[PDB]
Amino acid sequence: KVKVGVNGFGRIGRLVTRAAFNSGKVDIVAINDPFIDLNYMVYMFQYDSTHGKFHGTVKAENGKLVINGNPITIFQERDPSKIKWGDAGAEYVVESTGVFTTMEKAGAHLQGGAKRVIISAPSADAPMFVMGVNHEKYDNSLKIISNASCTTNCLAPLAKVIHDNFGIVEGLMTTVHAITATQKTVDGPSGKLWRDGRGALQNIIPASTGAAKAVGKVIPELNGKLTGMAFRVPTANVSVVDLTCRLEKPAKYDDIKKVVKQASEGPLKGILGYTEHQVVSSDFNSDTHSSTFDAGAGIALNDHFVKLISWYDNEFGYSNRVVDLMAHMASKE
Amino acid sequence: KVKVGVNGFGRIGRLVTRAAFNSGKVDIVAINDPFIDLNYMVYMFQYDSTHGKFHGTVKAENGKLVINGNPITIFQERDPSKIKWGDAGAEYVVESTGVFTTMEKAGAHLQGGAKRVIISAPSADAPMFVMGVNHEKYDNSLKIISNASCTTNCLAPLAKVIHDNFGIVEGLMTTVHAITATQKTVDGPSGKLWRDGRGALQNIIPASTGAAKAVGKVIPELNGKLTGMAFRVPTANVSVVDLTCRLEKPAKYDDIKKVVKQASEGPLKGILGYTEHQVVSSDFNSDTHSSTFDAGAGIALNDHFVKLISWYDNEFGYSNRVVDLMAHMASKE
Amino acid sequence: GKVKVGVNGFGRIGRLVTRAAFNSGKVDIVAINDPFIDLNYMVYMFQYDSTHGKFHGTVKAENGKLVINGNPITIFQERDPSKIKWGDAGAEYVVESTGVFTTMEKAGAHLQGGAKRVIISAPSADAPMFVMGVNHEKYDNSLKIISNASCTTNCLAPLAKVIHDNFGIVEGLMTTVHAITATQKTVDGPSGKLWRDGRGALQNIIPASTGAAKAVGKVIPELNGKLTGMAFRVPTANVSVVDLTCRLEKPAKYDDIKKVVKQASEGPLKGILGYTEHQVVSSDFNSDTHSSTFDAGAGIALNDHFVKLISWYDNEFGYSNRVVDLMAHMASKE
Amino acid sequence: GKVKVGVNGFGRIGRLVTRAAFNSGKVDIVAINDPFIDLNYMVYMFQYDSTHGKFHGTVKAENGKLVINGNPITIFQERDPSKIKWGDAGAEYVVESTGVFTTMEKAGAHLQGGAKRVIISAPSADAPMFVMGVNHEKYDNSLKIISNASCTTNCLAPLAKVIHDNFGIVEGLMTTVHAITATQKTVDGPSGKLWRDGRGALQNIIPASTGAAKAVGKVIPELNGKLTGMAFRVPTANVSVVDLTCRLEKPAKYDDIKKVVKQASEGPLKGILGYTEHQVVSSDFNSDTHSSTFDAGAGIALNDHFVKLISWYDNEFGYSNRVVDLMAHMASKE
């Protein structure tokens, strides 16, 4: 099992750490957060308002964060080039702070001793991957890669199935997204994105998302054929993608249900899900799928113009894919 | 000023009454609700969690509901044919209970003495109207009409402008809607629509809506060219329409903005609004427009496939249109 | 052997009692009656839960029965409780969860169908009330119709018992900051009897009257007339908190209050009364089966005789598990 | 003769004090200092408000100034308060609303720029604290730096004053069910000092410590050491409620408590202390400029000496209007 280091014990960093222990696919050996001390890290990992108390043991012992008897080395560095990743035995580093997404900034970890870096966010220049869509294009020469956004990971598996079977001429997407840590409880300041500063509890907030554009950077045939926007709404977790698209070949709705059902049962098992149940957002809380096609929620205007709905736990689905990507990277070593 | 009777003092009935006094276009002279007594009606009209305390005076006096010194006759009938609408001087009756939407059911009010009935909801058989779109097709022979739904009243004015200028080849709509009185606080029973029974506070609930299909009945050229679905989200009021459509003529996004701005300043003034501000849902609370085009929120894939965003106060916007429709009917009398 | 139980009403309490029965395995649900929810809808409502998640097990409709974990349950669709053939389905006890038959005369209708005992999963004006860990030992086989009090009394009474037994409660006033309930409205709607309860649940803090503190007196007779309170309904889907401000007879340092509560949670009230010193919030008690959990860090003392004691409760799980525990206790006395 | 005021910080308090100044017209805002919010963003933040709606007038950027209702306001972008040219803009008083300069030494920096008096819109460790209607008459012209206490202190103190003056408060314990604040997090985030305050604001009832009941003893010296309490943050955007459980020296029937509160709201505490017998909920006090409104129907008495008194407050508009009223009072004493 590959030994992993996690930079940042924020919402992504903690959920990637929890996915690592829950799945057991990788071994967390080090965590770096210059602001959260060891005692606070135990509290933040143990208790979760959204996903509940950690099913396992969490304790501070000899200056280390012990999760299920596994001692994890804690670092408090502000500069990523100063983290002694190699000393703690961290082969891979999950860059989850969101402030080092370019290969230049993400490359500071390689100076500490890390061999590979996985950016748990979209990157402007690093190669992007989505498990089940283009992870086979990963090779050992790639020292710094990105796992795209949770929305890019929800849309791309559905886009792959729909394009492979009927061909997406063009598509426009909307994601009705749950509130995130970047939003404000009451009307506050967000100098760059004014709407994002408005009260998260009281508002439907339109937001810009490069996730539908990013899908074309992972399914190169769809490059320039997809774009979209988001609406942040007052729910703590679980989001939904709404893809309105035009198809090349005609597609009856029940043929597109059969097509997604096959992919969910075969190659995209655990990545792409399929349901015909009368589901609502809370039904996908702690669901580890990247995306789950909602058959009953979608609607077709004609054989070439459809609206396809797909749910995703923006927190769990994505953190599990970061772990799956590293497990795949380790197998190619 | 025409004298109006309101059947049902529910959320629509109270807000239509409020719009009548706020705008002064109509005179409410009678209200019928077999369940809410006069004292409770004073409380429900005066205090509103969403729109605040009524700006004016409300009292119970001599068995009459007195709003701004205007005495309103109160009836407690379960059978709509037994309401003495004519005795109270009610020329038009707003049928807001939602349980008498067919012309046969809504026609019962004419037995009590009413001359015309306006169903404040979609009807299976009554002629439908949307102010600013097809209200000129109303004529004095029509004794029972429908004002369509609040979502139709938001989509149809935008669809009218977009189709008149560029031609809508086909369109698919999503409405991210605020919670309604038909939803449940916690997981409860809704035998017909299972998803609508699930906890309103905790969930994004997909729902079916014939509002996009209904635009084809007020704009006969778009018949069969539009359909959609809804997502109910945890906000008390203000909803948004997201129209993804293909245009016949090419349309740069600034040309779409230009023609919408012109319609909002000219013929659809007060019905269709236009904004370039960094708005969120709460900015449209108590906004009486039927729909307000959000220029900054929309996105174009090319010059033939666009996503157009438009806000609507699902409560005040529609209620004011019920009053405007009656103010129109009176002018044709 | 395990008591066979019938559940009247498949509403929020009825489903969670049925859930607690299978999760704990203390009793066997053999029949359910709801005249409005059909068998197919019952499968959906039991399987999926927004608050507590999908049911850990299997649930399916098969041959007109609701099979949960391979156990077939007989479904009835009766509006009149006297017309339910409880005895035919083998139901020895009936949980009256509809909330509309809380008097002994109304709840007694279930005995006409063949039931032997009726447990009202709500407060009753006349039936004997019980709170597990406080006065369940006063239950005897002569009692054919009993009440399990409310969720709020089942939270307050175990804390009141410990505090009164050790220091004596001279007088107390409590406030419960409660989660939204099925009786509330999504937007400003009509609630003819309780006008405030009709106002939008999402937008408001709604003051409400509750006889739960008064009901503690009917379970700890020494505190009769010594306790009263009110509630504030707030916009959270589940988990509530009790705030008891009281005057004590004997002096009590806050660490002595903590010490005696910790002892009771580890000994006789294990699983009923909990104790924590952690930096907890409401979501930390979601699906917690305790009747009440004393929050040591949240409470505050003015002086040795005047304190504010905070205690959390999953108003949904804590209570339904106590309905199951009460019937398991009744079965042991048979 | 409107006193010309400067506002340091265009955060929620700063904007709401500016809004109260124009809505009430009691003082003239002439300058605003915020080193992070530029003029164009200030127009947006003042014009649109999720809680209180769009401003009742006009807001625009013109010639590098913020013009509200035709009144041009000078904008400063200084990080050091001592470097703000308050005197050049004509600002006689400065409202210190950033929350980071609450000591008299820190708040005194504004006097170096040319200000004559500084009003801290928050509690201060050392500055004299005032609550309008309870101790504002103790303000005198020697006081160049004062504090307006907190929003909860301004709610509790006027009710405590009436109750103590008529019946005498032997001892009291207060709980405030408070709306969410800017210091909370949307989802589980870090708050190193107060761990519970970092947990998701939308999902939780969060117990919190508050020195607001203790602080009432400063403005009402007769209640020093006689009051303490805690808070519960709940998922509502605005409007909070105080719950005072207290023991009275003199017996008081609940109708006598109502009678004396109604008299104070109609007489000396008109506009500060309100009184209602209506079936009110929190949203009914949104944009209500009262410091506290006694809810007659929500409170409950156990006996003539032990009561729970409920009082609502718009934690935003109540307090902001008191900052403006306090400065209008200071100007009258000049």
Numbering used by the authors:
A (entry chain H), B (entry chain E): 3 to 335
C (entry chain A), D (entry chain C): 2 to 335
Paste lines from the article.
The GAPDH-catalysed forward reaction occurs at an important transition point in glycolysis between the enzymatic steps that consume and generate ATP. HsGAPDH was purified from the supernatant of HEK293F cells treated with the mannosidase inhibitors kifunensine and kept for 4 days at 37°C after transfection with a DNA plasmid for recombinant expression of an endoplasmic reticulum glycoprotein. A fraction of the molecules shows Cys-S-sulfonic acid instead of Cys in the active site. GAPDH allostery is mediated by intra-dimer contacts (the active site of one dimer subunit is in close proximity to residues in the neighbouring subunit).
HsGAPDH crystal structures carrying a Cysteine-S-sulfonic acid modification of the catalytic cysteine Cys152. The protein sample from which crystal forms C and D were grown was analysed by mass spectrometry. HsGAPDH in crystal form C. The GAPDH monomer is in surface representation and coloured blue to red from N- to C-terminus. The inset shows the Cys152 S-sulfonic acid chains adopting slightly different conformations in different molecules in the asymmetric unit.
